[PDB]
Amino acid sequence: EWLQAEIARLKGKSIVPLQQVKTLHDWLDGKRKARKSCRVVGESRTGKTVACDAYRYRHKPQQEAGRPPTVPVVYIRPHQKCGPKDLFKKITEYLKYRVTKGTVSDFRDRTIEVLKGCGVEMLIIDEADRLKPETFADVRDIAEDLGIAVVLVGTDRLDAVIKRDEQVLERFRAHLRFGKLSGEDFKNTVEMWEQMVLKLPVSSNLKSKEMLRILTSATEGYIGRLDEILREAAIRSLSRGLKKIDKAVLQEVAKEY
Amino acid sequence: EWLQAEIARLKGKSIVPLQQVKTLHDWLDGKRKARKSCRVVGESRTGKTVACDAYRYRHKPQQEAGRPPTVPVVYIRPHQKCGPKDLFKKITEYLKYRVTKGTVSDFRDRTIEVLKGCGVEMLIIDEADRLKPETFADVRDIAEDLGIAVVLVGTDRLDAVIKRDEQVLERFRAHLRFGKLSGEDFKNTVEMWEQMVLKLPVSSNLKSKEMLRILTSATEGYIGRLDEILREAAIRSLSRGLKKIDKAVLQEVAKEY
Amino acid sequence: EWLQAEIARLKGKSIVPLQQVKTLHDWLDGKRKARKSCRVVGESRTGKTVACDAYRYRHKPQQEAGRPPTVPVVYIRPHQKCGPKDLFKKITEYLKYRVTKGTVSDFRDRTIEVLKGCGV
Amino acid sequence: EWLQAEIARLKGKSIVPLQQVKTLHDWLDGKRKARKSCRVVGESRTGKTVACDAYRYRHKPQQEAGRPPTVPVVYIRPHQKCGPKDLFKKITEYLKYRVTKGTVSDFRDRTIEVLKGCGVEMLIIDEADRLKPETFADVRDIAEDLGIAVVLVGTDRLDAVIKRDEQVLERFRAHLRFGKLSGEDFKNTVEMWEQMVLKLPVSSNLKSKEMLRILTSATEGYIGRLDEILREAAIRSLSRGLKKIDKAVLQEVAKEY
DNA sequence: AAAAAAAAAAAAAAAAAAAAAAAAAAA
DNA sequence: TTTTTTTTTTTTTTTTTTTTTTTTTTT
Ligand SMILES: Nc1ncnc2c1ncn2[C@@H]1O[C@H](COP(=O)(O)OP(=O)(O)O)[C@@H](O)[C@H]1O
Ligand SMILES: Nc1ncnc2c1ncn2[C@@H]1O[C@H](COP(=O)(O)OP(=O)(O)O)[C@@H](O)[C@H]1O
Numbered sequence A, B, D: 001e002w003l004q005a006e007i008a009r010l011k012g013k014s015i016v017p018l019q020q021v022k023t024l025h026d027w028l029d030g031k032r033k034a035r036k037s038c039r040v041v042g043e044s045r046t047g048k049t050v051a052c053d054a055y056r057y058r059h060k061p062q063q064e065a066g067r068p069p070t071v072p073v074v075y076i077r078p079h080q081k082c083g084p085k086d087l088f089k090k091i092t093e094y095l096k097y098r099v100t101k102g103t104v105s106d107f108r109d110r111t112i113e114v115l116k117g118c119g120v121e122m123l124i125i126d127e128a129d130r131l132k133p134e135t136f137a138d139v140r141d142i143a144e145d146l147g148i149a150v151v152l153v154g155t156d157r158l159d160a161v162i163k164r165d166e167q168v169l170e171r172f173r174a175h176l177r178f179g180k181l182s183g184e185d186f187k188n189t190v191e192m193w194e195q196m197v198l199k200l201p202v203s204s205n206l207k208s209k210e211m212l213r214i215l216t217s218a219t220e221g222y223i224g225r226l227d228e229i230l231r232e233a234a235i236r237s238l239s240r241g242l243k244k245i246d247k248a249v250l251q252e253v254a255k256e257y
Numbered sequence C: 001e002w003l004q005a006e007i008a009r010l011k012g013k014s015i016v017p018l019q020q021v022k023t024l025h026d027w028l029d030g031k032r033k034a035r036k037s038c039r040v041v042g043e044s045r046t047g048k049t050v051a052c053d054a055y056r057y058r059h060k061p062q063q064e065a066g067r068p069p070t071v072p073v074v075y076i077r078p079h080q081k082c083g084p085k086d087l088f089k090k091i092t093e094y095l096k097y098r099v100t101k102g103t104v105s106d107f108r109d110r111t112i113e114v115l116k117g118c119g120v
Numbered sequence E: 001a002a003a004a005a006a007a008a009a010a011a012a013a014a015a016a017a018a019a020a021a022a023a024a025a026a027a
Numbered sequence F: 001t002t003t004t005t006t007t008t009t010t011t012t013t014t015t016t017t018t019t020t021t022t023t024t025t026t027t
């Protein structure tokens, strides 16, 4: 069944180029060449993790000689209430280096060693709100001991937590802020996203004022909502024998959430 | 590329002789001759750590005999929540010795042994606030047992840390303060920074009011912010093919950082 | 005094180039390029230790780049009845790395990692 | 340099199919289907290690199912004086499962769990002659509690340890010899060797009376001994400029080793 | 009414001894 | 062989701080 193949294909995830993504990539590349630490602030379901992650694929570490890998960008997602030891362990795990059983001071020394051996000019920390207040001192300690840029990606809680300590705030003053979709930006994004993700036999008439209206009402500018809504509508539309997404199907999916 | 060589020179660190650095150096020489302990208190981005390093560099340990080399000055920066054993390890790692597996009492003894063997006319400890209270007791123990002076570099909170212990208040009464740059001092230094650090082929006249307002407003009298801004502005200007920093280039960095 | 200077010089150390040393050095370069193990056999007070020590200085480590140093030749002198743990300690300390505490297996893993990092 | 490229090729490692290797592979497949433990005894420098490794390469991990890797064959190389903890830990790490730090009882249970989750039809221990006698009992316990066939790859030292326990000798009765080459087998192997490893613009005529006599005197039926000889003679000849191995060069190489 | 001072409950991090068993060694 | 002798290897009791939550008080 061809429909089965399309269902399986849609149930996946794909990357669709966007302007804000390119802006973030260029800004972060500038910071990486300057070795200047910074932070990034945005709302949930805006796709900032996808931008931080898509950037790292381009700069994947490649080593041809017998010497160990030289990695320029390392990327870790801390768990809830991640402490100092837990964070160091993740840095070591990402570099495919054997964790040494021992104490926290041993973890600190080992982390400095593995980071000194490789490049690791830029470190992208996601979900920085979850980071425990005790650990930020270690983060900036690393940023000062070695010339490595540190990027703290978080929401408004990141702002709130950072502004409580003077040194951390001084270290991470420069920043980039994400926005939401609206107007022509939103319409162009919907058109581009459907052309990039949907290969349905017939057009969905997305440009129509009414479809844009209901998608705006259900989306509110959050790409993390538009992607899910349109993918579910597509799977359901194809499942009922409709090659294209239809107005009633859109209304149904929007009503469920 | 020649521009890349100039940029690499701008990225590298250097030290400019300044009024505050010389003041601290003369004070420290007096204290070590008196063998008296004291404190150094200042704000962030004031360059007091750099001044300590510049002091250490002048007193090079020269051995003119077969007997072990003698170190007159020791410098340590403890890690977060440094305990007694960690500090003793730092002392014995700074000096060219090793410590075998053993107890805290053994570490105390080995540290005292190498401290007696070495000269250690003065001991400088950065970031005093991080030290644990028991570690403070041990620092005082060393200062009282051996003819060695102890300098506790600290921020505004150093007084608060030492207010919970009457004994350190009794022995560390003398103190020196670091301040900020304002008025004529800031302007004089700025001219010196343009001529002594930057590789700018053509002078940009930073002391002029048009370019003074920007530097002064963003910097707020902190040395670190100023040097950061100037190095970055020079790098950006040379990358653009300029032999002199333009007004727009100087203004962009301030807002970005 | 002239005499004291000459006497102090005489009581020091010096090296006389010999055909034995050059022979050893050519042979060792061959073995190093071929990555083959071998033996050096000789009586005491013949200075074979000095010849090997001199071989070491010809190929010095390069740390011009920011990366860890890549010393191609390591030279150690085990003490009497040296156990395996202590041999690993010698290797790790020579290359200027911290020796993690633990069992002989931990030292073994640490030493292999360091030996892969450097040229050796 | 083209010559250096050919030399780099000659300094590499290749694999050549021999009847000895195919015999071992068929025998091992039989034992794995039968789920019966056994052992292989063969002299040093025979290449049995390489034959077992090639066998492992024949059956790659089967991730075709959605949840676990389902690797049917594992292969571990114990270190000298391998204890039970190190053995269990190597087995665990080979299956990409984290080590649950604890006591040897925890390692035992964890290893059993990961061996049950994966297929693990057969387990191969390379150079088992340095496996501690305490741990052979653990190996037998694994072979009994789980439907796993265990193959021991060791030489003459295996049996002098196995015969120290009545229980272990019953498990590994099926034995296969793995010895040297001689006569027509040796001559055929040499010609195959001269064709596969010495892609050479000029035949060295190794399949001849005197060349075979030299190689036999130096080789004594050991392929491992022969490897260095032939590869190194080819490299030396090509470095000097000779397109093939002259008899004098071969004799010189043999004298060196 | 609505901010400011007060008893349980979880959770994380670190040496310092002691015993036993095995393996190698020396006359 | 008898004993020594060490050498690992593996298996075991005390000390301290930090949140959160909640209930009474006062103002
Ligand atoms: N550039 C993009 N291309 C395609 N889908 C995207 C993109 N950015 C976000 N998405 C969708 O949004 C989700 C990712 O958003 P998320 O990483 O949760 O945002 P954040 O982590 O910044 O809160 C994914 O499920 C994906 O489908
Ligand atoms: N005398 C100096 N010469 C050059 N640069 C200086 C000097 N003093 C401070 N700086 C700048 O300030 C930074 C050092 O500040 P820092 O080490 O944080 O001192 P502190 O710990 O006292 O704040 C350096 O990056 C350096 O560029």
Ligand SMILES: Nc1ncnc2c1ncn2[C@@H]1O[C@H](COP(=O)(O)OP(=O)(O)O)[C@@H](O)[C@H]1O
Pocket: C014, C015, C016, C017, C018, C043, C044, C045, C046, C047, C048, C049, C050
């Ligand atoms: N090539 C040499 N030139 C000068 N003196 C030498 C040379 N080789 C050895 N010696 C002398 O011999 C001593 C070193 O010999 P040593 O290294 O003990 O030999 P081995 O260790 O092989 O017994 C030194 O004290 C040195 O004076």
Ligand SMILES: Nc1ncnc2c1ncn2[C@@H]1O[C@H](COP(=O)(O)OP(=O)(O)O)[C@@H](O)[C@H]1O
Pocket: D013, D014, D015, D016, D017, D018, D021, D043, D044, D045, D046, D047, D048, D049, D050, D223, D224, D227
């Ligand atoms: N079938 C083969 N193909 C290629 N090389 C082989 C083969 N058999 C043996 N060799 C050579 O012999 C060596 C393998 O010997 P090894 O695995 O050490 O035997 P063991 O460890 O059983 O003594 C390798 O260096 C390899 O070059």
